[PDB]
């Protein structure tokens, strides 16, 4: 197609943002003027990977980040800037420690079996005061705030703005909601090819953060930003397709699922523990797993299990929180799912229970309850560790560092509880 | 001898404090007038153990705390109050979950082999502002404050007072020091029969806390009370004796130790991990083990190993911190030591290294680095768990609760590091 330089001329783009996601979900970007896009579209932009979360050294050569021209997004709030998602290349080949590179690998394995992952994201977020002390709306205070029309329309301006951008960009948004915590929201768009979805996820986090700042607010995807309120989820909708456009998950077993889906499901259940460290990747993530419901169970149309079946041909994975890496998250679910399929794994009986009331009477395999045990879990699950490749160890290394960091902090809790021993 | 009522008349005691130490080292006491001492000396004082750290229920009968008349201490700063240490009795028998009861059990086992434990305590403590924000002396600020004559004599009044009390009570004190952190002190008295020492430890913590308050200050034994300073140790000096007054630890092997001592030592090294949860019993304890030196090694005249040999017939155990239970600490070291002796256990080679410089090159068995792993360690070491009896599980239960408590706190560290994911 027409080179990025040519688009830059027709559509009036003055600068490109060349962007990649590192192991921690941090967006690293670089701002290049149009007069330079041509050269980089082809050779990529040069960063020093040791400065980002990539487990590299100062002595290594600068990595090259090659833009995916198919990913261009003209910032709807600032049209002269062109945003681009990029693969980090190192010494010729794509760098297997960058998340988009790892996602694209797992996809290629699945591809060569005529299996195509498609997923949707439920990115919840709070809107907060710029200084982070409190939610953005002091009038949002009732016990059960969910779907509060009052508080919802109080933030219409910023919501509507971002939703309309999504309409224009073609993501096909269909709903905007106030969620179950004061100050918390969700905006939903259509499911798509994993890679498409992933980019959209990385960009959505940027847009909402960016737009909210322009309205003198702040967006946070943090798992548990307030001691007194529920946290941010990032539940995921999954479906496997053939190139021929057929839903491999749709079938005639129970609930409308095929045997293939139930092996995929078995894969999830099989790797739930190590999978946990990846979609609950921060010390803060583990407040949510210590409310009650930390047990490994599906499913059915029921919001009380680690997995839900909403409809024929779909699994909802109610495990990942807001801190989830947009590329590392699909990547790792895919790994565990392809295993389910390749080892014809057994999910076990369904359970139509409400686990909040009747989950104590069920004997159930339990998820890890803190980062360290979670990392330990990922480190032992070699099937998983292999599906992500060199990334897995890098991740584990960083998160073991973060653990130590958090544990070295002197809390008021320590001093209140121990000053008197 | 003359009943406590008679002493009360000669020595002018108006009230008795009947005291016991619970699983957390908390001193539970009760204030009884002299007119009532007679009855309680014999039947004990009635508390409801469910209200203290004893793993009991409201439905249980009130425990009885029988004073040990041999332990009387007339508060040197308030002579009309008589302090007494007590065994918690429950339903006839001594309650095996109370620390003094557990210490006295292990001692009785050792006793029936003509083995008598004797130990000294190095109780370090900071003096702080009453509100706990800072050390008590703003003029104590140099890099290497240890043995600072200036700052030492700046707190002469309160030190000298407490030291002189110890002279009068017969504990045989021999030195008072400013320790290696700003605001931190140590006062040393003679070693003695474990049980004697233990009471003296429980009372020392009370006296220093009490006297310092009378001087408008505050004492803390907390492991790590300040982010910027070193912590409180509670190193212990150990020696085994026969009734005939002979030091079973004194011999002709290396360094002047007998084979018996080296099996005891082996016992320690053998149970170091599970022993850790007991003498490092708080979430706060684990800052000190994550400075560098968390490795299981003795020894010799060297302050870099988990164990030190200062002289013929003595082991110094450099493992316990200020939060250590005065009864649970001897109790548990004794257990691990009697095992060493009964299984003729092997400590391994000595190592005359400085572990701060040359400890990374040694392959060494590593202690647990956080409360939970520590509790796990104690739970698996059944030899140890058996030597303390019913206490061990109670302890483990409480500390697993404390862990959850600490992990449920929302720190500023979480919010600074995660608000932006």
Automatic annotation (TrEMBL), chains A, B:
Glycosyltransferase listed as a keyword: no
Residues binding Mg(2+) 3, per UniProt: 124, 179, 186
Binding site for ADP 1: 174-175, 188-189, 191, 237, 239, 308
Superkingdom of this protein's organism: Bacteria
Residues the entry annotates as binding ADP 2: 174, 189, 191, 239, 303, 308, 313-314
Record: residues binding Mg(2+) 2: 122, 235, 316
Keywords for the protein's UniProt record, in alphabetical order: Ligase, Metal-binding, Nucleotide-binding
Name of the protein described by the UniProt record: Type III glutamate--ammonia ligase
Organism: Rhodovulum sp. 12E13
């Amino acid at each position: 197609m027409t080179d990025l330089a040519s688009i830059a001329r027709e559509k009036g783009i003055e600068f490109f943002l060349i962007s990649f996601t590192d192991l921690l979900g941090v967006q690293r970007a670089k701002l290049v003027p149009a007069r330079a896009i041509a050269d980089m579209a082809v050779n990529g932009a040069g960063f020093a990977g040791f400065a980002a979360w990539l487990d590299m050294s100062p002595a290594d050569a600068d990595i090259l980040a090659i833009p995916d021209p198919e990913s261009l997004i003209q910032l709807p709030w600032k049209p002269s800037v062109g945003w681009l998602a990029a693969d980090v290349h190192f010494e010729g080949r794509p760098f297997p420690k960058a998340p988009r590179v790892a996602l694209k690998s797992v996809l290629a394995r699945a591809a060569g079996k005529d299996m195509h992952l498609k997923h949707g994201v439920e990115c919840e977020f709070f809107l907060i005061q710029p200084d982070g002390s409190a939610i953005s709306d002091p009038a949002d205070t009732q016990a059960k705030p969910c779907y509060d029309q009052d508080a919802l329309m109080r933030r219409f301006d910023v919501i509507a703005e971002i939703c309309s951008y999504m309409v224009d960009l073609g993501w096909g948004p269909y709903q905007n909601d106030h969620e179950d915590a004061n100050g918390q929201f969700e905006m939903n768009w259509d499911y798509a090819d994993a890679l498409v979805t992933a980019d959209r996820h990385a960009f959505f986090k940027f847009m909402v953060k960016s737009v909210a700042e322009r309205h003198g607010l702040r967006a946070t995807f943090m798992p548990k930003p307030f001691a007194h309120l529920t946290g941010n989820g990032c539940h995921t909708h999954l479906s496997m397709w053939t190139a021929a456009g057929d839903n491999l998950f749709e079938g005639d077993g129970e609930l409308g699922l095929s045997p293939t889906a139930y092996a995929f499901l078995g894969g999830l259940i099989g790797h739930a523990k190590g999978l946990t460290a990846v979609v609950n990747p921060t010390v803060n993530s583990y407040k949510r797993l210590n409310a009650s419901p930390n047990t490994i169970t599906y499913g059915g149309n029921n919001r009380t299990h680690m997995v839900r079946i909403p409809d024929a041909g779909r699994l909802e994975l109610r495990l990942p929180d807001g801190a989830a890496n947009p590329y590392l998250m699909p990547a790792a679910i895919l790994a565990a799912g392809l295993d389910g399929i390749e080892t014809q794994a057994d999910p076990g009986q369904r359970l139509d229970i409400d686990m909040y009331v009747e989950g104590h009477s069920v004997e159930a395999e339990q998820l890890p309850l803190n980062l360290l045990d979670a990392v330990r879990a990922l480190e032992a699950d070699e099937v998983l560790a292999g599906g992500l490749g060199a990334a897995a160890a890098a991740f584990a290394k960083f998160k073991r560092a973060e653990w130590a960091d958090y544990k070295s902090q002197l809390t008021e809790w320590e001093r209140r509880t121990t000053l008197d021993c």
